[PDB]
Design an enzyme around this catalytic site. Sequence first.
Site, PDB file in Angstrom:
ATOM      1  N   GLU A  35     -65.321-103.186  -5.764  1.00 19.82           N
ATOM      2  CA  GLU A  35     -65.353-101.909  -6.500  1.00 19.82           C
ATOM      3  C   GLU A  35     -65.691-100.749  -5.568  1.00 19.82           C
ATOM      4  O   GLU A  35     -65.095 -99.679  -5.659  1.00 19.82           O
ATOM      5  CB  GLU A  35     -66.375-101.963  -7.630  1.00 19.82           C
ATOM      6  CG  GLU A  35     -65.949-102.845  -8.804  1.00 19.82           C
ATOM      7  CD  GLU A  35     -64.807-102.251  -9.607  1.00 19.82           C
ATOM      8  OE1 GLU A  35     -64.429-101.068  -9.401  1.00 19.82           O
ATOM      9  OE2 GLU A  35     -64.215-102.984 -10.419  1.00 19.82           O
ATOM     10  N   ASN A  46     -60.179 -90.980 -12.318  1.00 16.82           N
ATOM     11  CA  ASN A  46     -59.093 -91.643 -13.053  1.00 16.82           C
ATOM     12  C   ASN A  46     -58.136 -90.653 -13.689  1.00 16.82           C
ATOM     13  O   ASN A  46     -58.457 -89.475 -13.844  1.00 16.82           O
ATOM     14  CB  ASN A  46     -59.664 -92.563 -14.131  1.00 16.82           C
ATOM     15  CG  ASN A  46     -60.631 -93.586 -13.571  1.00 16.82           C
ATOM     16  OD1 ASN A  46     -61.799 -93.623 -13.941  1.00 16.82           O
ATOM     17  ND2 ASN A  46     -60.151 -94.396 -12.655  1.00 16.82           N
ATOM     18  N   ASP A  48     -57.179 -90.338 -16.734  1.00 20.07           N
ATOM     19  CA  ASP A  48     -57.671 -89.796 -18.007  1.00 20.07           C
ATOM     20  C   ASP A  48     -58.717 -88.690 -17.849  1.00 20.07           C
ATOM     21  O   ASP A  48     -59.217 -88.156 -18.849  1.00 20.07           O
ATOM     22  CB  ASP A  48     -58.159 -90.914 -18.950  1.00 20.07           C
ATOM     23  CG  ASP A  48     -59.424 -91.613 -18.463  1.00 20.07           C
ATOM     24  OD1 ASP A  48     -59.981 -91.232 -17.423  1.00 20.07           O
ATOM     25  OD2 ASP A  48     -59.860 -92.580 -19.124  1.00 20.07           O
ATOM     26  N   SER A  50     -61.710 -89.107 -16.419  1.00 17.08           N
ATOM     27  CA  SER A  50     -63.030 -89.694 -16.248  1.00 17.08           C
ATOM     28  C   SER A  50     -63.195 -90.028 -14.763  1.00 17.08           C
ATOM     29  O   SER A  50     -62.239 -89.991 -14.012  1.00 17.08           O
ATOM     30  CB  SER A  50     -63.192 -90.959 -17.111  1.00 17.08           C
ATOM     31  OG  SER A  50     -62.334 -91.988 -16.646  1.00 17.08           O
ATOM     32  N   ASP A  52     -65.371 -92.810 -11.989  1.00 16.49           N
ATOM     33  CA  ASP A  52     -66.181 -94.026 -11.792  1.00 16.49           C
ATOM     34  C   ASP A  52     -67.237 -93.757 -10.705  1.00 16.49           C
ATOM     35  O   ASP A  52     -66.933 -93.128  -9.686  1.00 16.49           O
ATOM     36  CB  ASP A  52     -65.284 -95.180 -11.345  1.00 16.49           C
ATOM     37  CG  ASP A  52     -64.257 -95.567 -12.392  1.00 16.49           C
ATOM     38  OD1 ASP A  52     -64.522 -95.417 -13.594  1.00 16.49           O
ATOM     39  OD2 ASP A  52     -63.192 -96.067 -12.006  1.00 16.49           O
ATOM     40  N   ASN A  59     -68.016 -96.072 -15.468  1.00 14.86           N
ATOM     41  CA  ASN A  59     -67.105 -94.995 -15.906  1.00 14.86           C
ATOM     42  C   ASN A  59     -67.737 -93.954 -16.822  1.00 14.86           C
ATOM     43  O   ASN A  59     -68.546 -94.293 -17.665  1.00 14.86           O
ATOM     44  CB  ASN A  59     -65.912 -95.638 -16.603  1.00 14.86           C
ATOM     45  CG  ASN A  59     -64.847 -94.641 -16.964  1.00 14.86           C
ATOM     46  OD1 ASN A  59     -64.746 -94.217 -18.119  1.00 14.86           O
ATOM     47  ND2 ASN A  59     -64.057 -94.247 -15.987  1.00 14.86           N
ATOM     48  N   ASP A 101     -71.316-106.192 -23.692  1.00 14.21           N
ATOM     49  CA  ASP A 101     -70.507-105.420 -24.657  1.00 14.21           C
ATOM     50  C   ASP A 101     -69.393-106.211 -25.351  1.00 14.21           C
ATOM     51  O   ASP A 101     -68.714-105.681 -26.244  1.00 14.21           O
ATOM     52  CB  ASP A 101     -69.895-104.181 -23.965  1.00 14.21           C
ATOM     53  CG  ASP A 101     -69.517-103.064 -24.948  1.00 14.21           C
ATOM     54  OD1 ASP A 101     -70.352-102.700 -25.805  1.00 14.21           O
ATOM     55  OD2 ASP A 101     -68.386-102.532 -24.841  1.00 14.21           O
TER      56      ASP A 101
END
Length: 129
Positions: A35, A46, A48, A50, A52, A59, A101
């Site tokens: 990562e 990203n 969209d 957003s 990271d 995120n 989650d």
Amino acid sequence: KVFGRCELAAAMKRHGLDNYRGYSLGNWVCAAKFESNFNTQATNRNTDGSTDYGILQINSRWWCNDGRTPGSRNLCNIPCSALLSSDITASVNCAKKIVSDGNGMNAWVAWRNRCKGTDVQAWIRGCRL
Ligand SMILES: [Cl-]
Ligand SMILES: [Cl-]
Ligand SMILES: [Cl-]
Ligand code: NA
Ligand SMILES: [Xe]
Ligand SMILES: [Xe]
């Protein structure tokens, strides 16, 4: 900070990640390598809008607030900048919420594509743990 492989394994172990929700330590070290290349200051934007953040590339749409991701949820209740610290505590605590989650470590695309199903124990081989 850029961690060494064993140094990070030891830090993750101390923070309770070894076998957290059934994921052995090597899974966490492997996910961090791919990562962020073990760099706490890593950021990536990203499509969209957003971003990271940090060693586990958490995120901003869901997990942290960066002040520039509209309609985002801040589920870890932390500014995203907290995730860039040399102290991995905030990243670890948030990662525990993420892995709980429902989709487990599949939340991390690099883990799914590069660690899942591989010999992840190799990531902690040779370390004094
Ligand atoms: Cl392991
Ligand atoms: Cl960065
Ligand atoms: Cl990938
Ligand atoms: Na957010
Ligand atoms: Xe970025
Ligand atoms: Xe972490």
